[PDB]
Amino acid sequence: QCDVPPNSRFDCAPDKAITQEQCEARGCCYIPAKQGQPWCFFPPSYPSYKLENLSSSEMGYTATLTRTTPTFFPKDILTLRLDVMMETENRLHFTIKDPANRRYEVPLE
Amino acid sequence: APSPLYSVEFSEEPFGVIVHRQLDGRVLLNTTVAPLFFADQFLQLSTSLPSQYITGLAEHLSPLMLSTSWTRITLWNRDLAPTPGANLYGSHPFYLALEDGGSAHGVFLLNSNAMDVVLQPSPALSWRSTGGILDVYIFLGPEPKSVVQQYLDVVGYPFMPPYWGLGFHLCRWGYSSTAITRQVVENMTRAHFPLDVQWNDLDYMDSRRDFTFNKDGFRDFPAMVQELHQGGRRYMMIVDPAISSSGPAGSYRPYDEGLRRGVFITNETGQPLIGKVWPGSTAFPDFTNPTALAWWEDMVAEFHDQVPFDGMWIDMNEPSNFIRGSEDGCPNNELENPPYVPGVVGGTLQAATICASSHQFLSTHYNLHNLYGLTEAIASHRALVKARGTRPFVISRSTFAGHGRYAGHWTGDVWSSWEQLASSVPEILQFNLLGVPLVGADVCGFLGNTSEELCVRWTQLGAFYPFMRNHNSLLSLPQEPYSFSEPAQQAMRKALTLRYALLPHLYTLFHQAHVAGETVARPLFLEFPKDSSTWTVDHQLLWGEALLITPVLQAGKAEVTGYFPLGTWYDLQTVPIEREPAIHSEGQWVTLPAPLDTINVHLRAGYIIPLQGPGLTTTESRQQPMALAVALTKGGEARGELFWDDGESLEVLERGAYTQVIFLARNNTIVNELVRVTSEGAGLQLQKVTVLGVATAPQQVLSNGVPVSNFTYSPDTKVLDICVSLLMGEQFLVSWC
Ligand SMILES: *[C@@H]1O[C@H](CO[C@@H]2O[C@@H](C)[C@@H](O)[C@@H](O)[C@@H]2O)[C@@H](O[C@@H]2O[C@H](CO)[C@@H](O[C@@H]3O[C@H](CO)[C@@H](O)[C@H](O)[C@@H]3O)[C@H](O)[C@H]2NC(C)=O)[C@H](O)[C@H]1NC(C)=O
Ligand SMILES: *[C@@H]1O[C@H](CO)[C@@H](O[C@@H]2O[C@H](CO)[C@@H](O[C@@H]3O[C@H](CO)[C@@H](O)[C@H](O)[C@@H]3O)[C@H](O)[C@H]2NC(C)=O)[C@H](O)[C@H]1NC(C)=O
Ligand SMILES: *[C@@H]1O[C@H](CO[C@@H]2O[C@@H](C)[C@@H](O)[C@@H](O)[C@@H]2O)[C@@H](O[C@@H]2O[C@H](CO)[C@@H](O)[C@H](O)[C@H]2NC(C)=O)[C@H](O)[C@H]1NC(C)=O
Ligand SMILES: OC[C@@H]1[C@@H](O)[C@H](O)[C@@H](O)CN1CCCCCOCc1cc2ccccc2c2ccccc12
Ligand SMILES: *[C@@H]1O[C@H](CO)[C@@H](O[C@@H]2O[C@H](CO)[C@@H](O)[C@H](O)[C@H]2NC(C)=O)[C@H](O)[C@H]1NC(C)=O
Ligand SMILES: *[C@@H]1O[C@H](CO)[C@@H](O[C@@H]2O[C@H](CO)[C@@H](O)[C@H](O)[C@H]2NC(C)=O)[C@H](O)[C@H]1NC(C)=O
Ligand SMILES: [Cl-]
Ligand SMILES: [Cl-]
Ligand SMILES: [Cl-]
Ligand SMILES: [Cl-]
Ligand SMILES: [Cl-]
Ligand SMILES: [Cl-]
Ligand SMILES: [Cl-]
Ligand SMILES: [Cl-]
Ligand SMILES: [Cl-]
Ligand SMILES: [Cl-]
């Protein structure tokens, strides 16, 4: 589970200095660098979101994404909506949003 | 076959978006590589990268190709003199990734929150944003130039500058009177240095306030600017966003009227957030408020009625604050003290700016900060259209993705150092990839004191910045062209003369940027992506497809080694303007002679470039006869084009108020093909045709079937120089044998 090549380790403690015990308590892997590369990193089993109810539209796809285990950040949005729009032959566009709340979006024409 | 260039599939658990290139099955995006995080103030989406070669993610002082060695790139608009590892004035959350074989794709995250982008050597990337949503565009190319165009299809094609905006601009902090400012123009003119645009910094203002001029050194400010116009020049001056809040009520209309109309960013109690900038206490306009836009339009139009300036230099629009947050500090809340602080200089979102929880019309400053400069540029573009009725010219410090649709950029407070001269090339290329082709650095450098040698080399390279301005700090030694030794003045004059000769070509390149999402200054890898030796080249640049510039970027050098892609490259020194003549490259590094008086410029075989005769302004140069430089392939072929309009009207392409001509060389003939001919362009005189790569002396040269008045052939350089009397807008045939 923690046998991840050093260059493929994604940081499980981007937010603060962490001890081995705190890292393992987050459900992460603790392997010091031999000399930067994160010492605390996600195993492949680290809880993410699950895709549910993938559906086809004329534009592309829609789905629900569900997180069941909280992260170490406050205010996880546990239910997300995925929208995939096949806009042109060379432009693919997808959004991930909170279906229960309008969130800030950049004004664009 | 009708089908997208991409295919998409999804991982169920853990969730991921997988995007393949359909043609070769290459994995471009794969977000399964790391968990998806989506919390109120923390979004993280990761992907594999197709290669170790990735560019974008402005604004930072770095090589064009970003390091994948555990690099944290922070997007949080910040007033800081360019230095590596630091969040600078702008934020552009777009990358272009190269693929083995020379295809490419691009990714845009449409998110304006403070963010870190983390690159690792697997290779992989993580977007880490502090708010908003994940709004992701993938552009399939496959050519790097197509990726850029596809990105600009979403964020906006570059605006078309006025022709005069491509001339030389001269500024400093410290021209403390109209008398001194006039002497700059006099001194440039006496020494035969072209100058289209005279600038002032905050020297003009009354007590360092916008929309004022002092009645000491600048009492006759209106007359100075009218006189510049009488001589065929334009005038630019600095505008700050911050508005003096401390003056007696009714004594300072920009503040008094801004207060009446509620144009300012407000705090918790709904009063204007007060910071400290140049005039002392200041309020900050909210350029997301439609009423602030109307107010800004009015302040610019009213000031333009006093002093007819030709554009706006918008500085300190991060927005920059001399104190942290406000005079009243900032409240303790989750926006001021978020759970994840990206790698910003100073360790807080408040450093050198305003409170994150401050109120704007559309949202909090937390969400809108990275758009502050862009919103001011949009407001200023609109203000200048309404005030002047011709194309706006806005040069902005702070930028965001899509900035180039409205304005240009300069790279800020660069040191007068050989390292910053060198660093300016990748940075100008990067802004072109991001759709801000009107970009340059302060020629000879801003901070500290330039040397004469540095200022020669910087003027040489800077003459190939699409935006060319020499600007200088208050305590610096003078660095105007005329302030140097005679030999240095000659080298600087030659650089400006060559730029002015090339302006019809540079203007045509801006036309292609505006109508087709093309780059103006472009890295070799955009033009020759299938040659992997080009991928790391960022100390050379192209103008468009055909003009390769190889500058000296180090002290004490009399040669330079540059990469030459496969083909023939003619030394532009063989073209007459008022050492091998050809480099025959297999795709290789070539050491070129480069004495102090020289910058290497080569013209690609197969291209024709239009040139125009000399002038100390574009008002003068645009009246001169034109010339063609025709760079033949071994097979005798070349192609080029000219776009011409009145240089400053709005809606030219929509109204059809332009001339467009194609030039073709084939079988010892040169012709024009008339795409569009109108009154703007009709009387353009062609008086000289210079043909490069003519293997044998011709016996005769004809223009429209009659032996020409005069021609010269040089057997040593293989150049045929032809005198003609032709019109760009009427079909001609030039032939030799
Ligand atoms: C994945 O989607 C399923 C199915 O949802 C249904 O079909 C879709 C195409 C949409 O039209 C939906 O609006 C529609 O509900 C979801 O499972 C469904 O969950 C709902 C809500 O919990 C269930 O409703 C219940 O129905 C029973 C009687 O049949 C009532 O007694 C309850 O009061 C309640 O209304 C529904 O039965 C259930 N349907 C199935 C087939 O299981 C599912 O929640 C969704 N997954 C996620 C994570 O969103
Ligand atoms: C929101 O912004 C307003 C300004 O638009 C802030 O107003 C300022 O409030 C402070 C008190 O908190 C005032 O300071 C006081 O000034 C008087 C003398 O002028 C002095 O005698 C007091 O001891 C004190 O220093 C300050 O004058 C005032 N500024 C202005 C321009 O009126 C307000 O505090 C801001 N609110 C928050 C929560 O940040
Ligand atoms: C930039 O140069 C100025 C001025 O330098 C002096 O005058 C020039 C003509 C040149 O001959 C120099 O060698 C001279 O020393 C610097 O401002 C001076 O700074 C020194 C030391 O800090 C101070 O004692 C002088 O009085 C200043 N002189 C003036 C006219 O202001 C400035 O420091 C230089 N900037 C940098 C970053 O090196
Ligand atoms: O418009 C000037 C300049 C442009 O030329 C440049 O191109 C552009 O990128 C930056 N601007 C603003 C510079 C702000 C520096 C203040 O630095 C502390 C500072 C310096 C300074 C220097 C001279 C006099 C007064 C001050 C001052 C007064 C109060 C508070 C701070 C200061
Ligand atoms: C997308 O990335 C994911 C995760 O790195 C890859 O899935 C893993 O592939 C390895 C090797 O095939 C398997 O042993 C793992 O079980 C997979 N992990 C998961 C989480 O499924 C996946 O191969 C990549 N997809 C493509 C098309 O490259
Ligand atoms: C314009 O050039 C003039 C002439 O060279 C400059 O005036 C001289 O400046 C030096 C100071 O550097 C004085 O010692 C001389 O007395 C001046 N000579 C004359 C003939 O007036 C002038 O400063 C230049 N102005 C600008 C703004 O560059
Ligand atoms: Cl430990
Ligand atoms: Cl924790
Ligand atoms: Cl690299
Ligand atoms: Cl005018
Ligand atoms: Cl609103
Ligand atoms: Cl909001
Ligand atoms: Cl090489
Ligand atoms: Cl080399
Ligand atoms: Cl030269
Ligand atoms: Cl003729």
Residue numbers in the entry:
A (entry chain G): 81 to 115, 123 to 196
B (entry chain A): 204 to 781, 794 to 952
Which statements did the authors publish about this structure?
We developed and applied fluorescent activity-based probes reporting on either human GH30 lysosomal glucosylceramidase (GBA1, a retaining β-glucosidase) or GH31 lysosomal retaining α-glucosidase (GAA). Gaucher disease is rooted in genetic deficiency of the retaining β-glucosidase GBA1 (glucosylceramidase, glucocerebrosidase, member of the glycoside hydrolase (GH)30 superfamily of glycoside hydrolases)10 and Pompe disease is caused by genetic deficiency of the retaining α-glucosidase, GAA (member of the GH31 family). GBA1 and GAA produce glucose, but do so from different substrates and by following distinct reaction itineraries. However, and as dictated by the opposite (compared to glucosylceramide) anomeric configuration, it does so following the reverse reaction itinerary: 4C1 → [4H3]‡ → 1S3. Both GBA1 and GAA-mediated hydrolyses proceed through a flattened 4H3 transition state, a feature that, in combination with the occurrence of a covalent intermediate, can be capitalised on for the design of covalent inhibitors and activity-based probes (ABPs).
With the aim to prepare for such future studies, and with the thought that structural features of branched N-PNT-DNM 15 may be further optimized in a structure-assisted rational design program, we sought a co-crystal structure of a proteolytically digested form of rhGAA (Myozyme®) with compound 15. The rhGAA nucleophile Asp518 interacts tightly with the iminosugar endocyclic nitrogen. Beyond the iminosugar moiety, the alkyl chain of N-PNT-DNM 15 establishes hydrophobic interactions with the rhGAA side-chains of Met519, Trp376, Trp481, and Phe525.
